[PDB]
Structure formats: structure tokens, C-alpha cells
Design a protein around this nucleic acid. Sequence first.
RNA 1: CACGGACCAAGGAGUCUAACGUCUAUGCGAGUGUUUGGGUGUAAAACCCAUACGCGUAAUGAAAGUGAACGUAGGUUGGGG
RNA 2: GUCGAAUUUGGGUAUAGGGGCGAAAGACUAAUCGAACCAUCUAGUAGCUGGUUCCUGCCGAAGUUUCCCUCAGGAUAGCAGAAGCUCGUAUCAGUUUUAUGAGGUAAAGCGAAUGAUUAGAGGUUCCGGGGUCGAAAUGACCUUGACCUAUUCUCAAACUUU
RNA 3: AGAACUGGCGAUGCGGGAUGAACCGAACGUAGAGUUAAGGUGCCGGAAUACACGCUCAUCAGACACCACAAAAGGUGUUAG
RNA 4: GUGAUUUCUGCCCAGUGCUCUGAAUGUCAAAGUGAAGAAAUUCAACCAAGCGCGGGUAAACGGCGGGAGUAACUAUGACU
RNA 5: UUGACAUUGUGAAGAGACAUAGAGGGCUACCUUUAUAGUUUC
RNA 6: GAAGACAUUGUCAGGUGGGGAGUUUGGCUGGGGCGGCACAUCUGUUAAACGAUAACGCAGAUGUCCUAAGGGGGGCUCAUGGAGAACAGAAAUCUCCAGUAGAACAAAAGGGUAAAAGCCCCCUUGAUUUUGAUUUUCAGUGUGAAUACAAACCAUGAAAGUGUGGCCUAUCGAUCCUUUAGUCCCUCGGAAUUUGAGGCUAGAGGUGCCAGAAAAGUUACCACAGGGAUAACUGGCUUGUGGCAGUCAAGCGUUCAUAGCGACAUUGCUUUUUGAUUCUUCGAUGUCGGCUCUUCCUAUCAUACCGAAGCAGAAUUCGGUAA
RNA 7: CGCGGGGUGGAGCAGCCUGGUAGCUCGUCGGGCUCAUAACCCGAAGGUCGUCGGUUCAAAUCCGGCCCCCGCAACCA
Lengths: 103, 50
Amino acid sequence: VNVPKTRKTYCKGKTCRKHTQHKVTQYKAGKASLFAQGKRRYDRKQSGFGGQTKPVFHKKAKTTKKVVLRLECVKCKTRAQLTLKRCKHFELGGEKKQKGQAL
Amino acid sequence: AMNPVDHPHGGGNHQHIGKASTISRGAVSGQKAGLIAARRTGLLRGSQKT
RNA sequence: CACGGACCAAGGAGUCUAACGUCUAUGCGAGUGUUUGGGUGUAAAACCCAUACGCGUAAUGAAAGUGAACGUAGGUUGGGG
RNA sequence: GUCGAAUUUGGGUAUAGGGGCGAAAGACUAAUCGAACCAUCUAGUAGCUGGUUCCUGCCGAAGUUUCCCUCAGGAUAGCAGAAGCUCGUAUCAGUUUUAUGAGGUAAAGCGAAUGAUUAGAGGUUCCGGGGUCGAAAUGACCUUGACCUAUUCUCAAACUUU
RNA sequence: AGAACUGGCGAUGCGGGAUGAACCGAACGUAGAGUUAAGGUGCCGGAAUACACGCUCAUCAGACACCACAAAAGGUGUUAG
RNA sequence: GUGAUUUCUGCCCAGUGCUCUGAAUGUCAAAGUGAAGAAAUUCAACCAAGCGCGGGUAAACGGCGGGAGUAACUAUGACU
RNA sequence: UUGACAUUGUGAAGAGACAUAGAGGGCUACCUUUAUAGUUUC
RNA sequence: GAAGACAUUGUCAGGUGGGGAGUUUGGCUGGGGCGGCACAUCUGUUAAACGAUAACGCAGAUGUCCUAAGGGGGGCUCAUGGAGAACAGAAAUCUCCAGUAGAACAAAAGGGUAAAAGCCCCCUUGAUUUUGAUUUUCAGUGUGAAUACAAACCAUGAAAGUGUGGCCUAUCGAUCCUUUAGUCCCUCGGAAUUUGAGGCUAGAGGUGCCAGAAAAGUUACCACAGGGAUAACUGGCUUGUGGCAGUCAAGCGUUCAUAGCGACAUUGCUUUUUGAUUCUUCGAUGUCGGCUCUUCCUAUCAUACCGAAGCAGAAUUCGGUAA
RNA sequence: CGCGGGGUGGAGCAGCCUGGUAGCUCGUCGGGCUCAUAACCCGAAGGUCGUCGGUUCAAAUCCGGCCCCCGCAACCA
Ligand SMILES: [Zn+2]
């Protein structure tokens, strides 16, 4: 879809508590780390013998994901999140639809 | 002319190899039946070319 | 014209255990439970016993924690006696 | 059929179970082979089949809901019994009456909307197609097509005023 | 084959439909008397070869719901319009 | 693999295999090396075999199909 | 099958990178670079 | 003697690895397979005027799309018909009259909507934040969707008010894990500090068999527990189809409907075709055909006796009693 | 999925690294050549250089994102 590059939501910053500007950026998950209890438990569980020990998911059915608009307040830097409806093509770059022009 | 339990080449509604009979060096005992490690095959056309 | 049964005798299949729910009966009651163990014995019984210990009397929070009366322990309504 | 040899056979010996041996049939390996036999694990597991033992009395069902790799199974609600508990004729009822609502089925309707559908009648084309009089005309005449008006015959589960 | 409402069989005998899980009647402790249901009353077979008005003769008659089949089309057969 | 003798064994290495050069800003493990760190650690370059790339091979496993234009009756196509 | 470490010691040539010096290009960073009193891998 | 600190031997790591090992290889279903999705869903109808309600019943639709097609406000009125204007005609643009929606409002369809919910212009993010209640499906669980509120921060408009996504009914996702935002709080339990980690509240990564295992074939070498809950014989219900038979009479038959035929229709019968079904039988009723032998039926090929002819005779055709 | 490359007339390859005018082969046409036919030569057209943006005196080219394809490796919801 198409969303602006600036967005004005109610803020929760314990000093703002009002409408302040925010900066929108489509959310990327983030590099998975070790040293989280799930990974370390997985490593010991995989090690040795026994083959695979946890399921691996093969019957994928969906073709989209949910685009996450994470917001950054320009006054107090308190970052917030919102979730969108499923879509195929999303892009932050905002160009506005014109109706007078032809197709 | 065998049964699949008895040989790689056995089985099938017709007498045939099914897969390539040219077998690799790294093949294991049980898989090495046929033309071991062949560089070429067919009919010997040409000289030794050694 | 679905299955078992030719006949007879004898055997033959919802039990025991650890932990539990409801109901019931019994005792004592903010307590409760002698029998791990100790004493004793007519001796695997019967009888007696401390310290402990579990459950209840306090719960709510992941937690660090905090912790049960404004009042005749409230008002209104219905209530057996 | 073969019958002087890829011949027949005794004794010895070697080869042991996912192993042997196989001129190849999954054949043979002690009447056992597409994985021998013996004991043990082992009362192996079965949503499936079969059976499941004395009498009388009282009560008395279900094949239906939702979820489940769910469809010969379970869980769950319901139907049933038992124990009762608090009260003592009432905040009751597979019923009627009165008053007030709701509904779009049966019927009905198409000279009402939508859709379908029979027949002619009357009109208009600067603007349908043709034949006649015309060099042509927004000239005229006859016919066919649609168009309009007032009618006419027959209809609808996904049409309808009522 | 699949549904709706209700009643049933399953789980249920008894009288009746000859016979039958489902129809009709009626639901059941052990007996006696009386009266009935549905069905019946020539004989089998308990009960009128009852009474009354008509119709039908069939050289394949007809004879009681569920239910155990018969149609279009025809007949100076016969009856009534 | 085929199955005496006789005779002949045609075309196809794209695919699956097999096998060879390694002339490599391709990929790539453990170790080892460097940077940041207070360390656990993170990052980065580098890097064997193998794969990938490029040759050979069908008496390896196998495969041997369409379409268009054409010859002076048509039809058909030696030709393209 | 391939690599690494250990078994596992004793030396020279060529190549690769660091700390002493250095001619030519950008007070003082680097390349064409060359012998090391020294450290390092093929 | 050869090789030589390389082989070899030991451990770890990457590739290869049906030689071998273990395992898996949906469901519904007029039997299974193929097909399809009736599996998660949505509109109209079946549906029998509350609700509910089945079929692999009927016509379809969904895994999306939209920074506006979301929110607020203002102005205007649509489709179409008629009459007119240079090029300009049936379709360009312009004017008027008529015009209850006969247009449009993303898609499927049904409701709804006209000084709007339609078309154009202006401003903005109310598609925001905090947790509760409630409707639907229902177990009065979850999920999705929605309703009306309460406490903040705003948008628009003069203001009243409206605004918690899309005019409504579909448009979607638990546990564990990982990861992000927030709280910068609790814990790391002999005492401290700092990284690291674990906790707390709200999101994301997804299970389409959609209340959500991690999963390829073959068996004609086969096995077991069962099923007549389920197919392939017979039998039973049915008779489309098969076969046979009627009624009517436009016509053929030179002429003439009916000697013999007979269109368009229509009414039946049979169970000697094949279907449809799934009642019996899967702790088994021996599934082709022929041979042999008996008996039964009539819808009669011959033989008996007859009726009719487009029957001169001959031959033949139609029909009756007759197995 | 982590890294990496490619997209140029109707079809197929050079030109990318060089930042400076887009070349060649087949196809189409016209002209030339031969007394003709064929063949052979020459010229016209043919690639928004996949799309958008940035950098530069200047971008098909270098870089970022997107569409498609390809290579190795990886993958506990
Ligand atoms: Zn703020």
C-alpha cells in the first residue's frame, strides 16, 4: 500500500501524553541471537545423536505477512508499533493519487 | 536377471539396468556393481591415447 | 439361507494398590493425626508417649513484596424458627 | 527326458539368520523362508471380534449439540438414576382468552415494479430496410423492422403491490 | 438418498389387519363378574343362511385402508340420467 | 551387458549418471589470523575436499518428435 | 574421502606480511620498494 | 634395503553416502480410486411467513483491495429519454426540459442510501491511547467481525454534532520457540558493580486437513484385527434404457386412413438387456462357457383347424384357438 | 535464503569494468553488381539499452530499490 513518512498519533512518553509527530518504518524482525534460552536448549537437544528433535514446518499456506509500522516520536523517542492488514506490495514512499489526470 | 533384494540391477517388469551402470570410486560395498570408475565406455574407437 | 452352541461334569472373566472427586457414618474440634520411632507387653495384638512432621486456621502478585473491621463486621429484599 | 558326462553318489569338511548358499524360482538354509528354529523381554499393544455367572422390587434412556489426523473412537451438552437440601401450594404450565407485536410462506398478481410472454388495432420517423413516381428535397405513395399509445393470452425457487 | 413438525418401533406384550418391528384398537401385578374398542357374525370360527332398497352373470366375475397393482381407448351387455 | 555361426550394429553427450582439466573477486567446515571488547562474545578477511563452471563418454542409463515452403493433372516431396 | 592437531624431530633456497633505515609521487599518513640486529606463514 | 619425519595410528570437522537403519506416505465420499471440496468461510434459495435445519441440492463469492476506496465538512444530482448547436454522424463537447434511482457507492450477491451513503473541493489522521461490558457462531469456550459505553489526545464544521477503519452481511490463526516495542521495574538466591541472561504488558514470524503432527511410493511374494457399517454373483424394490404391446389417424398404398403399413402424439406391459440401489451374505451360498438331463412359460418358427387380403391358381402377408 | 550475476532491435550476440558517438549476425525493404538467375555488396527502419531514484561537466554503463531468471550454501514457530 502507501502511507506517509510522518504520522501523528497520541503519544505515551510520560511527559508528552498527547499528539506528537512520529516517524514510520516498516519493521524488520532482527538478527536472531544465541544465548537465548530457546537456542541453547535447542543446541544441547540437537547435539549427539537422534537426528532432528523438533518439528520443521513444511506446509506453508500463506503468501503475505502483516506489515508493522513502528513509530519513532520526534520529541521523546518513545517508539511504538502498529499492525496493518495483509497486502502483497507495500512501500513507505508516499506519492499521492491524482484524479484529474488520465490513466 | 535377479531380484531387487539380490542385486542393484534386479527387478522390474523388463530385464534392464534402470540407472547408469557406470559407478563412482566413492561408492560403497554393495553399490559397486557394473563398470567401476569408467572414464569412458562404449566401443573402443581410437588408439590407447596414453 | 447372519455368527457360537453334539452331550455332560469341574474350572472360568471388573480385582488389588498409590494418589484422588462427590456422598455417607464416626470422633475430636481451631485444631487434627498413638502405631517413623520410644516405653511396655499375656508378644506380629492390646496399652501408653515427647520432639517433630503434613493438612487447616491467609491470601494476592512472575517476582522483589505486601497482607484481611468506617460501621452493633454494613444496607435493602425474601426468609424457617 | 537324459543316460560317459556342466554326469550320479557316499563319507569328511567349510560357509549361519538382515546372515549363508543361489546355472536366479525369492529358490533352498531339518515337512518351517519375501528373513529359520529355541528361550527370554512378554500377561508385548489393539478406537476391533467374541464371552462376562443369583432372585425380586422401584425408576428408566440415547442415537442428538460442538471440538478433535474427527467419520467402527473420544471429549463435551443433553436425555437417566441416586443422594438429598430449603420451603409447604407458591416467581408454576408442551392449554385457552383478552390486549399488543413480529413474519413474507400458502394463496393471489402481472390493462403494478423486475423478468418472461400471445395477438392484432391506432400513430409518429429532418433519424431503419426495401419497391413506385421522381436528377434530388427536411418530396409523395405500398411493405417490412423497431418506437409510442390503449388493449389482449399466459407465467416465476432464487419476481412482487397485497 | 436427504431434510421439517408430530406420533411411533428400537425398549412392547395383548385384541384386530390370515400371515408382518412400524398400520387400527389398546399399552400389561394376580383373579372373578359385567361392558366394549378396532375387527367381525354361511362353515372352518365365538356371533343373525338378520331385516330393507337397488345393481351385477363375467368361455380369466367380485369379495374391505397401509397392502400386496393395472392405464389410455372401446361395447344396442344392462341400469339410471 | 549381450547371448552359437553368418551379417550388421545407424543418429543423439541436451538430461540423469560416470569421468577429466583446474587457468578461478563464485559457494564453503573445524581449526588458525586480525579488529572492537573488561571478558564471555560479535564482526571481518582468508580458506581443503565437494558443488557450481568448462571438456570426454551411449556394446552408460537411455532417446530417435513436431512445423512451413516447394516437382507441368492431382497427390506427394528428392530440395530448403 | 578431505582438512586440523598429536605421534614428531633435525636445515637451506623462492614467495607473503610486520618493527630499524630509505630515492622517485603527497608540521608529516601511503606506494614503485630494497639489505635486515629481529617476528612470521606457503 | 626402501620410504621417512610424509605415510600409518588417535581425536575433532566438512562432503559423499538405499550399502544399511528407523519411520511416514490426510479427510469427506451413493464402495474405493480418478474427479471435486460440500474441510476455514461468505450472499440468495431450497427453508415449509420467529429461530433452527440436511444432500458431492441450485446460482455464485473469499486467502484480496484501499493513505485513501479510512475520518470530518461543504457544494452539486444520477442512469436515461426528448428537443437543439461548425466540423460533429448512433458514440466527442455544449444548452434546456423530463426524469424515485431505472446510475454509482473495489469485489460476490442481497439489503441500504438523493439537499446522500452518490459525484467534485477543503482539512486531517478517530485506521490514535487505556483496559472492561455486550451481540453473532456457542459449550453461552476460543478465534474473527461487530455494538454501545467509560478515561485521554485530536480532526472538521459557524455550530449542533459527527469521527474507536472501509454504507452493512465474508475477507482469517492457540501452546512452545524466536524477535520487536513498552515498563527501565523484579531475579540471577554468600555480598557488591557492569555486560549478558531470565521474568512482566502489547505486537510480529503459522499452522489453507484453517480449535493448529515435522512425512514418498510399491506389493500380481504378502500379513493381521475386523466389516455384509462397504464393492465384484444371485435374489429383492424400480424400469430410465432394452424388449414387447396398445389408442388417434396426417399420410403411403394409382384411385382408397385402417388389405398391408403408418408420422406427430400418447397409454401400458415384462424382468430373457443394461442401469439405479446397497436389504441378505465377507468365522466364504464355489461368479464364464460348453456338455448332459428334466421340467416350466407363450410374446407360435413348424405341424392341426380356421378368419382377412391390394387371396384367379401357385406362392405369400395379416390375424384367432392353440405349448 | 546470505552472498553474486544477468536483462541491449522481430530473434541472437558485442559495447558494462572506459562515464563521452549504441556495433555485428539472421529477418524486412530499396539500390548496386551480372547480358540474366542465383550468389555477393551497399545503404533505410529496427533495442524508453527492464522500471524508478541518486551521484557527475556528463550515466545503457557507477550506486540504492523493485520485476524475472540463474549458481552454491542455509533453514527448531
Ligand atoms: Zn512523546
